[PDB]
């Protein structure tokens with residue numbers, strides 16, 4: 001059914017190769033999840049990604065084009081092959097390169113990211129790990145959100161270490177204050193902080209808050225945003241963090257005009273609405289699409305929502321490796337049953 005072109009990716013997630021469907025000639029990406037059922041955590045992540053990707057049908061979200069069925073007896077089925085959209089590059093590679101990246105690239109890239117998030121957020125899915133390298137870009141300039149391994153809903157299981165250890169959730173440089181500080185307000189606003197960091201990074205072609213560790217990350221955010229308000233400080237989970245913030249002299253926010261000199265006024269207005277300490281003070285993905293900065297591309301009638309919401313109940317279940325394997329195999333079966 002597929003002719004392998006060349007092996008591209010490795011590792012942690014598995015091996016990624018480019019390929020073509022022999023009959024149609026259609027170019028695809030094939031990801032091999034080797035020994036997919038050996039580790040609970042990894043198997044749970046595979047299951048979660050398969051369901052999330054099967055749930056969405058959106059141009060700015062990576063899609064499963066095919067899932068290869070077992071070709072061996074059930075007991076011998078050990079590695080999963082997922083056929084995905086072939087995406088040549090990513091936003092990290094574009095930002096950090098000799099390629100052009102004008103205000104017009106920023107505007108179009110931001111538009112697509114926000115269009116994809118509006119859809120995902122309406123399904124009650126918080127990606128929690130947005131960063132330029134997870135924003136894949138093809139040769140036609142289509143941006144797609146990938147890597148849904150860290151994604152969660154509005155309600156998560158207390159059985160997971162992350163439930164309590166929010167400061168290890170995702171990547172330090174794009175991690176929302178609520179996760180860093182355990183503010184007990186974990187909504188789609190987590191993603192809008194990440195968007196602001198990505199937006200800033202596209203404007204200057206360098207990371208906005210590249211903290212060397214936990215404290216340095218907090219320092220970096222406060223050097224621009226100013227000291228958090230007492231309402232935020234009181235909500236800080238840990239006393240050592242709370243005490244550390246209070247041990248520092250008062251700081252007023254620095255205008256985005258100083259951080260990004262001579263940058264577009266409408267780009268800084270939108271950036272300001274995204275990068276706020278308080279999750280509820282942040283602009284939503286839907287309201288950001290209505291901002292004058294994205295007026296050129298914005299069509300309310302071409303920016304869909306996702307109905308019905310995605311349910312994370314399956315992920316909260318304590319399953320053994322074998323029970324997760326059965327669930328994954330049932331997902332591959334459902335994929336083919338829905339197609340036929």
Ligand SMILES: O=C(Nc1cccnc1)c1cc(C(=O)c2c(F)cccc2Br)c[nH]1
Nearest residue numbers: 008013029031062084085086087088146147
């Ligand atoms: O085509 C892809 N990768 C490529 C790169 C470079 C050259 N050729 C091909 C591709 C990757 C994907 C993904 O969802 C993906 C992944 F498999 C592994 C890690 C992150 C992510 Br996000 C879809 N498509």
